[PDB]
Amino acid sequence: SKFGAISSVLNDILSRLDPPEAEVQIDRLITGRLQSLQTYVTQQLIRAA
């Protein structure tokens, strides 16, 4: 999922954009991916309980 950025694949976005404008999009990717991981870990905790 692009998560509202240019692309959903880091190894392309890092080479298509320079750092001082790419950090925003990579931060969007980080926040989306980590929110998804938080959802996954919470659901796993509930299932484990």
Binding site: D18, P19, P20, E21
Partner: protein, 49 residues
């Protein structure tokens, strides 16, 4: 006038008109690329008169 800085760098150089718009972090141009590149995490001011 309310802040305490460790050290201050004062770099002075006379340049053209459009080159004032050229100078900024994450910029480009004949001067911003081979004559003066500001740091990407620049924390300061540029003065042009």
């Amino acid at each position: 006038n309310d802040l305490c800085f460790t050290n201050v760098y004062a770099d002075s150089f006379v340049i053209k008109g459009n080159e004032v718009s050229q100078i900024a972090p994450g910029q480009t141009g004949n001067i911003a690329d081979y004559n003066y590149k500001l740091p990407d995490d620049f924390t300061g001011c540029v003065i042009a008169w």
